[PDB]
Design an enzyme around this catalytic site. Structure first.
Site, PDB file in Angstrom:
ATOM      1  N   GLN A   1      56.336 121.453  -1.763  1.00  0.00           N
ATOM      2  CA  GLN A   1      55.977 122.524  -0.559  1.00  0.00           C
ATOM      3  C   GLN A   1      57.592 123.045  -0.987  1.00  0.00           C
ATOM      4  O   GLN A   1      57.615 124.010  -0.987  1.00  0.00           O
ATOM      5  CB  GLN A   1      55.323 121.967  -0.040  1.00  0.00           C
ATOM      6  CG  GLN A   1      54.541 123.031   0.627  1.00  0.00           C
ATOM      7  CD  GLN A   1      54.532 123.279   1.965  1.00  0.00           C
ATOM      8  OE1 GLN A   1      55.711 124.028   2.357  1.00  0.00           O
ATOM      9  NE2 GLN A   1      53.935 123.554   2.701  1.00  0.00           N
ATOM     10  N   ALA A   2      58.833 122.390  -0.090  1.00  0.00           N
ATOM     11  CA  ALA A   2      59.993 122.088  -0.099  1.00  0.00           C
ATOM     12  C   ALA A   2      60.286 123.326  -1.769  1.00  0.00           C
ATOM     13  O   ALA A   2      60.593 124.787  -1.507  1.00  0.00           O
ATOM     14  CB  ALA A   2      61.028 121.856   0.175  1.00  0.00           C
TER      15      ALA A   2
ATOM     16  N   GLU B   1      49.325 119.584  -3.886  1.00  0.00           N
ATOM     17  CA  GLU B   1      48.219 120.868  -3.129  1.00  0.00           C
ATOM     18  C   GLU B   1      48.152 121.957  -4.382  1.00  0.00           C
ATOM     19  O   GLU B   1      49.783 122.218  -4.698  1.00  0.00           O
ATOM     20  CB  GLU B   1      48.029 120.690  -2.224  1.00  0.00           C
ATOM     21  CG  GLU B   1      49.854 121.155  -1.003  1.00  0.00           C
ATOM     22  CD  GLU B   1      50.301 121.740  -0.295  1.00  0.00           C
ATOM     23  OE1 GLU B   1      50.896 121.729   0.674  1.00  0.00           O
ATOM     24  OE2 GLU B   1      49.309 122.044   0.196  1.00  0.00           O
TER      25      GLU B   1
ATOM     26  N   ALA C   1      50.494 114.340  -0.902  1.00  0.00           N
ATOM     27  CA  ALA C   1      50.422 112.703  -0.530  1.00  0.00           C
ATOM     28  C   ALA C   1      50.405 112.812   1.211  1.00  0.00           C
ATOM     29  O   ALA C   1      51.080 111.594   1.334  1.00  0.00           O
ATOM     30  CB  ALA C   1      52.215 112.692  -0.751  1.00  0.00           C
TER      31      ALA C   1
ATOM     32  N   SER D   1      62.001 118.482  -1.074  1.00  0.00           N
ATOM     33  CA  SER D   1      62.501 118.218   0.302  1.00  0.00           C
ATOM     34  C   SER D   1      63.087 117.066   0.094  1.00  0.00           C
ATOM     35  O   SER D   1      63.626 116.174  -1.097  1.00  0.00           O
ATOM     36  CB  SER D   1      61.746 118.227   1.127  1.00  0.00           C
ATOM     37  OG  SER D   1      60.624 117.618   0.587  1.00  0.00           O
TER      38      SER D   1
ATOM     39  N   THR E   1      59.997 119.828  10.911  1.00  0.00           N
ATOM     40  CA  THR E   1      60.634 118.319  10.265  1.00  0.00           C
ATOM     41  C   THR E   1      58.595 117.859  11.217  1.00  0.00           C
ATOM     42  O   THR E   1      58.517 118.067  12.119  1.00  0.00           O
ATOM     43  CB  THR E   1      61.190 117.997  11.132  1.00  0.00           C
ATOM     44  OG1 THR E   1      61.685 116.258  10.552  1.00  0.00           O
ATOM     45  CG2 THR E   1      61.194 117.785  12.922  1.00  0.00           C
TER      46      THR E   1
ATOM     47  N   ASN F   1      65.188 130.081   2.565  1.00  0.00           N
ATOM     48  CA  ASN F   1      65.262 130.409   1.542  1.00  0.00           C
ATOM     49  C   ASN F   1      66.113 131.613   0.390  1.00  0.00           C
ATOM     50  O   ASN F   1      66.613 130.800  -0.689  1.00  0.00           O
ATOM     51  CB  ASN F   1      63.795 130.039   0.461  1.00  0.00           C
ATOM     52  CG  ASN F   1      63.410 129.151   0.833  1.00  0.00           C
ATOM     53  OD1 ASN F   1      62.865 128.913   2.247  1.00  0.00           O
ATOM     54  ND2 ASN F   1      62.317 128.393  -0.001  1.00  0.00           N
TER      55      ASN F   1
ATOM     56  N   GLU G   1      79.990 118.765 -16.139  1.00  0.00           N
ATOM     57  CA  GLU G   1      81.857 119.184 -15.467  1.00  0.00           C
ATOM     58  C   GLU G   1      81.940 118.993 -13.728  1.00  0.00           C
ATOM     59  O   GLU G   1      82.582 118.089 -13.383  1.00  0.00           O
ATOM     60  CB  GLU G   1      81.622 120.584 -15.499  1.00  0.00           C
ATOM     61  CG  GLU G   1      82.375 121.242 -16.686  1.00  0.00           C
ATOM     62  CD  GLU G   1      83.486 122.294 -16.519  1.00  0.00           C
ATOM     63  OE1 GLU G   1      83.759 123.571 -17.667  1.00  0.00           O
ATOM     64  OE2 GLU G   1      84.495 123.013 -15.843  1.00  0.00           O
TER      65      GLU G   1
HETATM   66  N1  GTP Z   1      63.854 125.677   3.358  1.00  0.00           N
HETATM   67  C1  GTP Z   1      62.356 125.053   3.428  1.00  0.00           C
HETATM   68  N2  GTP Z   1      62.473 123.638   3.708  1.00  0.00           N
HETATM   69  C2  GTP Z   1      60.771 123.343   3.584  1.00  0.00           C
HETATM   70  C3  GTP Z   1      60.305 125.013   3.198  1.00  0.00           C
HETATM   71  N3  GTP Z   1      59.204 124.283   2.745  1.00  0.00           N
HETATM   72  C4  GTP Z   1      59.409 122.826   3.753  1.00  0.00           C
HETATM   73  N4  GTP Z   1      60.328 122.698   4.365  1.00  0.00           N
HETATM   74  C5  GTP Z   1      60.719 121.358   4.787  1.00  0.00           C
HETATM   75  O1  GTP Z   1      60.668 120.074   3.965  1.00  0.00           O
HETATM   76  C6  GTP Z   1      60.078 119.394   4.407  1.00  0.00           C
HETATM   77  C7  GTP Z   1      58.851 118.110   4.749  1.00  0.00           C
HETATM   78  O2  GTP Z   1      58.351 118.650   3.086  1.00  0.00           O
HETATM   79  P1  GTP Z   1      57.687 119.776   2.441  1.00  0.00           P
HETATM   80  O3  GTP Z   1      58.189 119.734   0.777  1.00  0.00           O
HETATM   81  O4  GTP Z   1      56.939 120.490   3.158  1.00  0.00           O
HETATM   82  O5  GTP Z   1      56.371 118.905   2.435  1.00  0.00           O
HETATM   83  P2  GTP Z   1      56.214 118.292   0.647  1.00  0.00           P
HETATM   84  O6  GTP Z   1      54.921 116.528   0.978  1.00  0.00           O
HETATM   85  O7  GTP Z   1      56.862 117.744  -0.575  1.00  0.00           O
HETATM   86  O8  GTP Z   1      54.193 118.639   0.214  1.00  0.00           O
HETATM   87  P3  GTP Z   1      53.186 119.143   0.776  1.00  0.00           P
HETATM   88  O9  GTP Z   1      52.896 118.080   0.799  1.00  0.00           O
HETATM   89  O10 GTP Z   1      52.314 120.022  -0.244  1.00  0.00           O
HETATM   90  O11 GTP Z   1      53.405 120.292   2.088  1.00  0.00           O
HETATM   91  C8  GTP Z   1      60.491 119.950   5.907  1.00  0.00           C
HETATM   92  O12 GTP Z   1      61.978 119.177   6.230  1.00  0.00           O
HETATM   93  C9  GTP Z   1      60.487 120.941   6.366  1.00  0.00           C
HETATM   94  O13 GTP Z   1      60.752 121.982   7.777  1.00  0.00           O
HETATM   95  C10 GTP Z   1      60.767 125.732   2.431  1.00  0.00           C
HETATM   96  O14 GTP Z   1      60.065 126.757   1.779  1.00  0.00           O
HETATM   97  N5  GTP Z   1      62.267 125.916   3.230  1.00  0.00           N
HETATM   98  C1  LOC Z   2      45.707 119.798  11.006  1.00  0.00           C
HETATM   99  O1  LOC Z   2      46.822 119.765  12.512  1.00  0.00           O
HETATM  100  C2  LOC Z   2      47.739 119.495  12.759  1.00  0.00           C
HETATM  101  C3  LOC Z   2      49.144 118.865  11.845  1.00  0.00           C
HETATM  102  C4  LOC Z   2      50.206 118.034  11.914  1.00  0.00           C
HETATM  103  C5  LOC Z   2      50.217 117.803  13.022  1.00  0.00           C
HETATM  104  C6  LOC Z   2      50.455 118.848  14.137  1.00  0.00           C
HETATM  105  O2  LOC Z   2      50.743 119.065  15.641  1.00  0.00           O
HETATM  106  C7  LOC Z   2      51.231 120.088  15.155  1.00  0.00           C
HETATM  107  C8  LOC Z   2      48.518 119.646  13.960  1.00  0.00           C
HETATM  108  O3  LOC Z   2      47.755 120.950  14.962  1.00  0.00           O
HETATM  109  C9  LOC Z   2      47.195 119.470  15.594  1.00  0.00           C
HETATM  110  C10 LOC Z   2      51.639 117.158  13.706  1.00  0.00           C
HETATM  111  C11 LOC Z   2      51.481 116.352  14.843  1.00  0.00           C
HETATM  112  C12 LOC Z   2      52.149 115.539  15.711  1.00  0.00           C
HETATM  113  C13 LOC Z   2      53.073 115.247  15.354  1.00  0.00           C
HETATM  114  O4  LOC Z   2      54.415 114.349  15.111  1.00  0.00           O
HETATM  115  C14 LOC Z   2      53.936 113.273  16.532  1.00  0.00           C
HETATM  116  C15 LOC Z   2      54.652 116.123  13.882  1.00  0.00           C
HETATM  117  O5  LOC Z   2      55.612 115.521  13.871  1.00  0.00           O
HETATM  118  C16 LOC Z   2      53.716 116.676  12.851  1.00  0.00           C
HETATM  119  C17 LOC Z   2      52.603 117.650  12.987  1.00  0.00           C
HETATM  120  C18 LOC Z   2      52.525 118.357  12.002  1.00  0.00           C
HETATM  121  N1  LOC Z   2      53.773 119.127  10.687  1.00  0.00           N
HETATM  122  C19 LOC Z   2      54.550 119.473  11.241  1.00  0.00           C
HETATM  123  C20 LOC Z   2      56.039 119.791  10.969  1.00  0.00           C
HETATM  124  O6  LOC Z   2      53.945 120.011  12.265  1.00  0.00           O
HETATM  125  C21 LOC Z   2      52.017 117.517  10.389  1.00  0.00           C
HETATM  126  C22 LOC Z   2      50.590 117.089  10.486  1.00  0.00           C
HETATM  127 MG    MG Z   3      53.853 115.900   1.348  1.00  0.00          MG
END
Ligand code: GTP
Ligand code: LOC
Ligand code: MG
Ligand code: 3WD
Ligand code: GTP
Ligand code: GDP
Ligand code: GDP
Ligand code: MG
EC number: 3.6.5.-
Lengths: 430, 430, 123, 429, 428
Positions: free
Chosen positions: D10-11, D63, D91, D132, D171, D220, D246
């Site tokens: 994703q990131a 995904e 994951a 990320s 986060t 970004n 380098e």
């Molecule tokens: N700067 C920046 N950070 C991102 C972006 N997408 C996700 N992140 C950060 O990356 C962290 C989470 O990683 P993800 O890449 O979204 O998760 P992933 O497991 O690698 O991918 P998915 O499971 O497919 O969502 C968090 O700290 C997010 O804020 C993006 O487009 N830009």
């Molecule tokens: C499918 O819906 C949800 C799914 C999740 C979260 C969530 O609450 C905002 C949701 O809404 C109900 C979520 C929950 C709790 C967390 O910490 C307790 C966290 O760090 C993080 C999260 C979510 N991650 C973020 C960065 O929002 C991922 C999982």
């Molecule tokens: Mg993941």
């Protein structure tokens, strides 16, 4: 369902024929046996005492029996007499000589089998035979002897059915036939084992009633018989007439008889009328209730107040107030409470029939199981023990191939019934 | 679906059935022929390809009379001749005759007819048994039947509607025996039993309906209103409520503690003029007064293990709650510390329907309160005393024994009764 | 001081203070796979143990629904066998009461005969 | 000369969407693969018989979602279907899920794309890995891959581009677990790693770009500037940082202390009136202010070991050296004993390109700044404690053990991060 | 992708509302057809609906009941015409508020019939996340079969996720005595077989209706309105496209720190009354502190008696992200005693620009607080009240059961309470 009736000896037929007269009139049956009554209710339970014969005629389920042709012929030539089937008249010629042993063992056994031939035949014509009904004197030869022989012989063949008797108790007041106590003692034993329920009809009481109350100077058998007929329609009312029961000889036995040997009932009637005497004016509800429980009204010469009632049944006839009937009935057992066993809860039952007896706008019949009846037996035993002590008129008996030991047995059997009667009299709840 | 087969044993059973069955017909617009102009009533009524609706019921009796009155009756067409089973000889007030001697002869044919009614059940809930505690058929035959359905249908639900004997309402000396013997033999085979104390029904007619001498018709019709209220939850389906079996769960904490106490309200005479009508709380309070109880007992003194309210006609929760709250403040309704204090409530839509040319008046809203109080055990204790009184002397015991029974059965039955009394003592402990 | 000169680029070193100290200091596929396969086993074993627990829970249900059935085919067996004896004992009993009362009546029929015989003896 | 740019999860995928967006702009490529009338831009583009220049990049994610947003967008034509690898399910924020579970499943397929990408090289310099830190995909899978790239295409360089997680920027509660587990696994395999603190970027989109709550796009747009400003010399004909090797030389002296801190200047918004565009000294002094840092740490308190100043556009050397003289005049700024106090300046004359119709505005002068300071440990310590609070009471661990991994690997990762922390202690004397 | 199973009176009723609530949010008219305004609604429609081209959108739901009644209510219902006929899986013998009937005897007969349906509904998904069960814990179907289903599902899809909307009984709402028995037996099975469990307490829903909503005589419709409200609010991140971009398993990984401790305290603000009356906007703090207060929780536990292990909070509508974030950090800085310190940034906030139906701003809350042991103690007390005397137990032993199974259920639950009281006492 149906009742088969057996009348035996001079007294058996005499009382039986009057019963048959009384009840026929009550049911709209004329002497030719045809019906011409006005109420459907008369026929509702007609099937109990009458065989519905050909040509829409009704004919009693009755067997007439005697070891003499005498009374048998008077009945045949009687008012109704023709009404009975002439095949059912099972009669002998020998006589029973006011001897129980001639009846029960000798002259009587020769006719017994011929009697059962007719009894089997009447039992056949039954959708469901309830049981038997026997009218007899315990003081004669045929009544006492052959009547108890028949009991024993029916009992063998129909153990499952009820055995109910109207037994008439001897008195010196009526018959100077010395041996009468012997015959009465021997019959009482046979009764104590072979019948389910017996209405003890004491001729001592009967004479006294006509004499002291009815003011008949020289009362006749006709005079005593009228009371017996009064009583019979009374006791048989719930069996013949439709009411709120249901209406079985067995149900009555089960309720009225607490212990087997103790099935001798003290009947009582009210009002007490003279034979063929037009009624004055009707008795009030309390008058009936009061009179019915009076020693003066009892069909057996015993004082109910000298004992305790195990069970009582009262039948009220005529169109009277049942709230008044019930008010009185309770009042009586609430003051006289001390004359009813605490160990048989609710021992007084009451039935009402809107159909009053002939010439009476209002009557009441009493049926009680009083320990008082021991007085009746005591009297008999006393008179028996007197003669027996002497070994009086004993060859009349041993002449029929009998035993002196049979008497000593019977004596004790009588005594044990008194000891048993007194046992429950005295008996407490605690 | 959710099928319910009714069984009416003996005089009391059948006559209550007729009272129930005519009322049921009224409730569901059913005409005495069977035809009718909520598919839910089908639980009680089978339907033919002709459009005639037949009750899922069986009328049994050891004698014809009572059933014949149905057979020539105003509803002669309401049942199949097959489903109205009569004998020829009654049990003469003897449990040993109902259970053995006589009923043995009819049992197989009866069960066979019940099975034919069963074969027409897509999903049978169970059985409803209407009998007398007193009668020889109501006691002995019933037990025999319950015993045989427990083999035949296994653990299938069996309900009772038994009639607790009262002196004021007929009764016979031997009924305490029959009453104890049945309870004992039936205990295992019964899921839940509605005891009806004839004295209460008597007292309610006498006080509310103003009937100096109530007829069986007056009693039976009253009883029917209470029964139809208990069964409304099955013959009717409403969003509002109506939901038995769920009640059964609250009412029965332990198998043997299955006899609820019913308190119906209101019983109004069809001559009480101005009346029209009552409030929810008026009728809700009526339930807590003893003078409305189906069985004469004192729940003010005992403890509760369940309380259920069965409303009908025009009832809205808003005011049921209001009523229930006002009650729950008062400290006479003391429950055990092992079960909650809530009252399980069910509400019907169909107003109480009253019998044309009846004694009761038309009500805007009726209630029946089913509850598990330790005080019902007073009815047992009452019955037991009368048993003990007679048995102490073995009064009438010969009749049982003569029909095959053993003295042991009475002691067995009596000990069971005593254990049941201890079970209620034990259960009310906190 | 210089580094290198390019096309659309360039570079040069810039030294402001010199370094105080002159000296400076003071993998296989099998083993990654051996480690990966090792963790996959662990994931597969815990899955297998969880499967075992559900299988025992499935068996449990089999046994309970079984007891419920067995409990019924014991209730029916008792109720029936209780009935068998109750009906039979009554049969024997009532019939024996009936058999005794007939012996007694036949016994008294014996007496009758010897009385008729005793009448003949006297004659 | 050639370079494979790998984008993991994703990131890394979204960030890589932006980088190639900027490279296409700088070099003049159309989102279809074609271009109109220095050449070295090819070190990132392979030509097809139909004149199109396909980005030497491989985008992976567990995904579909994210990659479909590419294979729908105007840059769909750019890349072939083979280079955009997608799985059925991600994951679920679990490193153990990314590495052991969904990992094993996809590894070879991803490597095969890289192989066929690699089978097209005159000699591969190395790889540039985008991901990320806290993602289950952008941590579990990447670390597994980095392990394999070291075995399959051994000796070749690795330039990590990692996004350091921040609360203010989406986060997840398990992020520090993932973050260290990845750093422990990606340690012995990375040659150079550039952290991007999401907090630092977020702040810069606010104070300088006037956006209170910035979008990923915005964040970004800024990341890509720096990343493009890093790759400036590779894609063009520059002299400083011409090759991937380098960076190791210019910034990484001790092998494990391979985390240089970046600084960009100027950070300019378009929605504002025009003014006199900044001089060299204006943007140079801006390279030492913590407000313009790529990562959140105090370089004022921490000994340095290297420094490089990467200029873009309208810059002049005399105007650069004049600014280096001014800094040593007022500030002294500490360095480690075993290292010479001095910069390595490099100027690429190509103009700073900005996304047409974006938050970032047109600039003639720009300067990114690579510097390795002991102060980067201050960024690790922040994370090491977060991990230590949760692991102390074993919170969330069950999910990792559930995916195969041992509890032994949590202590092992932290123990190693505690050694890396002491390495900044041994150096920062 | 998500498969939806609903069991029993409660379960189907609750479920039918969630299904009619979300259909309005997604432009699905009761005849299964898209009539919505923005394509933002169809963006994540595939999570809950399937295509029957059509277009025809069919809810990915299985209707389960051991008696017909409730199913027919829905069939005759307003949205009812929406469900696949082939998905109404019912019986005729109703379990009759018996966990034993539902879980053992009765349900077992209908179990495989249902499972075959779920097998079919899962073949039509590219990639399923897991399952969603709506059921009560006081009856028989939802309580017993619902647990049994979960177990047979776990056995069929181990890897798939288990989500439940379990309605906890109370002695206030409903009077069926047996309830604690059913509940405890269900709870015992949830502790082991689900991953996320939304603990909805009827005690709480009644008190909210009664006291706060001024509802003099609350109905099920009223209780269910609050449940449906939350059920949509907790699924906002699954069906609505935002920066999240998350699912059921990521939610589990982040909410549940310890396997057994996975029972959540649901919470909604504002607490809307049925039909009436809307009007007047909410200020950001008004929406935030209301939501964190106990009088807004669907579970009957005071969160001031525990410590929040993790918190999830979705805010809907148009609002300043700043103001909301500002209010969250303010609340955490205020009530720091009741938030576990040993789990950094354990309070997560979400946003969605599309507000719910009628209320133009709402906030759903999901707390994993140690306080939830209070709900269990409450149940365990009622259980043991009847249990010491072995009251009503006959209804269960008749179904083939053992007393042992009751001992275990309470013991396993008493252990759960002792488990919550470890981290309730723990620091950093
Ligand atoms: N700067 C920046 N950070 C991102 C972006 N997408 C996700 N992140 C950060 O990356 C962290 C989470 O990683 P993800 O890449 O979204 O998760 P992933 O497991 O690698 O991918 P998915 O499971 O497919 O969502 C968090 O700290 C997010 O804020 C993006 O487009 N830009
Ligand atoms: C499918 O819906 C949800 C799914 C999740 C979260 C969530 O609450 C905002 C949701 O809404 C109900 C979520 C929950 C709790 C967390 O910490 C307790 C966290 O760090 C993080 C999260 C979510 N991650 C973020 C960065 O929002 C991922 C999982
Ligand atoms: Mg993941
Ligand atoms: C404490 C719980 C309790 C049971 C409750 C509800 C139940 C209810 O509303 N019930 C129980 C049947 C159904 C329902 C209501 O009466 C038709 C309607 C409006 C409803 O909500 N029906 C639907 C849902 C619905 C929603 C919107 C519009 C229309 C219908 C349902 N169908 C099936 C299941 S729920 O009655 C008010 N209640 C306070 C009560 O007063 C009840 N009493 C009790 O519980 C006490 C006194 C504590 N023992 C009783 C007298 C009714
Ligand atoms: N309520 C009520 N009580 C009755 C009725 N008939 C009889 N009883 C009661 O039942 C008892 C008598 O039992 P029965 O039902 O008459 O007897 P049974 O043996 O079953 O039937 P039969 O042999 O035909 O007389 C007494 O306690 C009566 O008070 C009736 O129709 N209604
Ligand atoms: N009341 C009444 N008693 C009678 C009648 N005939 C005889 N008795 C009595 O019956 C006894 C004699 O019985 P009886 O019938 O003459 O003898 P049997 O014909 O040989 O049986 C005596 O005690 C008489 O008092 C009669 O018609 N009425
Ligand atoms: N909140 C809520 N609870 C309900 C509803 N219907 C029933 N209940 C509860 O459900 C419990 C009994 O379970 P129920 O759903 O009726 O039975 P089942 O068919 O066996 O699952 C009791 O605690 C009731 O309060 C409903 O629509 N909403
Ligand atoms: Mg009878």
């Amino acid at each position: 369902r149906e009742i088969v009736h057996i009348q035996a000896g001079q007294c058996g037929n005499q009382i039986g024929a009057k019963f048959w007269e009384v009840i026929s009139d009550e049911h709209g049956i004329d002497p030719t046996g045809s019906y011409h009554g006005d109420s459907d209710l008369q026929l509702e339970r007609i099937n109990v005492y009458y065989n519905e014969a050909t040509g829409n005629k009704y004919v009693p389920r009755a067997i007439l029996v005697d070891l003499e042709p005498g009374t048998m012929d008077s009945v045949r030539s009687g008012p109704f007499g023709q009404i009975f089937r002439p095949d059912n008249f099972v009669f002998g010629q020998s006589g029973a000589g006011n001897n129980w042993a001639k009846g029960h063992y000798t002259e009587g056994a020769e006719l017994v089998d011929s009697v059962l031939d007719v009894v089997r035949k009447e039992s056949e014509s039954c959708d469901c035979l309830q049981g038997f009904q026997l009218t007899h004197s315990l003081g004669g030869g045929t009544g006492s002897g052959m009547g108890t022989l028949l009991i024993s012989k029916i009992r063998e063949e129909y153990p499952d059915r009820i055995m109910n008797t109207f037994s008439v108790m001897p008195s010196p007041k009526v018959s100077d036939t010395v041996v009468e106590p012997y015959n009465a003692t021997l019959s009482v034993h046979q009764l104590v084992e072979n019948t389910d329920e017996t209405y003890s009809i004491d001729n001592e009481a009967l004479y006294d009633i006509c004499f002291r109350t009815l003011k008949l100077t020289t009362p006749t058998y006709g005079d005593l018989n009228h009371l017996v007929s009064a009583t019979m329609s009374g006791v048989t009312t719930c069996l013949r007439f439709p009411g709120q029961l249901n209406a079985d000889l067995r149900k009555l036995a089960v309720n009225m008889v607490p212990f087997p040997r103790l099935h001798f009932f003290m009947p009582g009637f009210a009002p007490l009328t003279s034979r063929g005497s037009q009624q004055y004016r009707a008795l009030t509800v309390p008058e009936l209730t009061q009179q019915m429980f009076d020693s003066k009204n009892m069909m057996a010469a015993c004082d109910p107040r000298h004992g305790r009632y195990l069970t009582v049944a009262a039948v009220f006839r005529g169109r009277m107030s049942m709230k008044e009937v019930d008010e009185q009935m309770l009042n009586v057992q609430n003051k006289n409470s001390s004359y009813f066993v605490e160990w048989i809860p609710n021992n007084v039952k009451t039935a009402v029939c809107d159909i009053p007896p002939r010439g009476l706008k209002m009557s009441a019949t009493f049926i009680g199981n009083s320990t008082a009846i021991q007085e009746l037996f005591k009297r008999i035993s006393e008179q028996f023990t007197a003669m027996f002590r002497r070994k009086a008129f004993l060859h009349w008996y041993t002449g029929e191939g009998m035993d002196e030991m049979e008497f000593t047995e019977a004596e004790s059997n009588m005594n044990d019934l008194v000891s048993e009667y007194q046992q429950y009299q005295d008996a407490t709840a605690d | 679906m959710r099928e319910c087969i009714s069984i009416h044993v003996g005089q009391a059973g059948v006559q209550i059935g007729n009272a129930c069955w005519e009322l049921y017909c009224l409730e569901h617009g059913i005409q005495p022929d069977g035809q009718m102009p909520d598919d839910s009533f089908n639980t009680f009524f089978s339907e033919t390809g002709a459009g005639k609706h037949v009750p899922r019921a069986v009328f049994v009796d050891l004698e014809p009379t009572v059933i014949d009155e149905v057979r020539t009756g105003t509803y002669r067409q309401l049942f199949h001749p097959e489903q109205l089973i009569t004998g020829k000889e009654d049990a003469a007030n003897n449990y040993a005759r109902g259970h053995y001697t006589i009923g043995k002869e009819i049992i197989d044919l009866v069960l066979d007819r019940i099975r034919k009614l069963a074969d027409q059940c897509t999903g049978l809930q169970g059985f409803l048994v209407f009998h007398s505690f007193g009668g020889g058929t109501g006691s002995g035959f019933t037990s025999l039947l319950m015993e045989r359905l427990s083999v035949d249908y296994g653990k299938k639900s069996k309900l009772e509607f038994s009639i607790y004997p009262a002196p004021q309402v007929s009764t016979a000396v031997v009924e305490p025996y029959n009453s104890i013997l049945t309870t004992h033999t039936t205990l295992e085979h019964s899921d839940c039993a509605f005891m009806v104390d004839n004295e209460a029904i008597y007292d309610i007619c006498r006080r509310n309906l103003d009937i100096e001498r109530p007829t069986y018709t007056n009693l039976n019709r009253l009883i029917g209103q209470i029964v139809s209220s208990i069964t409304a939850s099955l013959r009717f389906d409403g969003a509002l409520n109506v939901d038995l079996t769920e009640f059964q769960t609250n009412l029965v904490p332990y198998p043997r503690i299955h006899f609820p106490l019913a308190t119906y309200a209101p019983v109004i005479s069809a001559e009480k003029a101005y009346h029209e009508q009552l409030s929810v709380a008026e009728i809700t309070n009526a339930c807590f007064e003893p003078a409305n109880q189906m069985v004469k007992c004192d729940p003010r003194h005992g403890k509760y293990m369940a309380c259920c309210l069965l409303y009908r006609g025009d009832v809205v929760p808003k005011d049921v709650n209001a009523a229930i709250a006002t009650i729950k403040t008062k400290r006479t309704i003391q429950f055990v510390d092992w079960c909650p204090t809530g009252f399980k409530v069910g509400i019907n839509y169909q107003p109480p329907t009253v019998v044309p040319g009846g004694d009761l008046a038309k009500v805007q809203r009726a209630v029946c309160m089913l509850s598990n109080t330790t005080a019902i055990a007073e009815a047992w204790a009452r019955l037991d005393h009368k048993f003990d009184l007679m048995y102490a002397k073995r009064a009438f015991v010969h009749w049982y024994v003569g029909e095959g029974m053993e003295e042991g059965e009475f002691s067995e039955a009596r000990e069971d009764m005593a254990a049941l009394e201890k079970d209620y003592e034990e259960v009310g402990v906190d | 001081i210089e580094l290198n000169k390019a096309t659309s680029g360039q570079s040069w070193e810039v030294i402001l203070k010199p370094p105080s100290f002159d000296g400076v200091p003071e993998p296989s596929l099998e083993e990654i796979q051996k480690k990966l396969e090792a963790a996959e086993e662990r994931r597969k074993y815990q899955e297998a143990e969880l499967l075992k627990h559900l299988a025992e829970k499935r068996e449990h249900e089999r046994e309970v629904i079984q007891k419920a059935i067995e409990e019924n085919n014991n209730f029916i067996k008792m109720a029936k066998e209780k009935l068998a004896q109750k009906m039979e004992s009554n049969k024997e009993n009532r019939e024996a009461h009936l058999a005794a009362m007939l012996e007694r009546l036949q016994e008294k029929d014996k007496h009758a005969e010897e009385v008729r015989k005793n009448k003949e003896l006297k004659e």
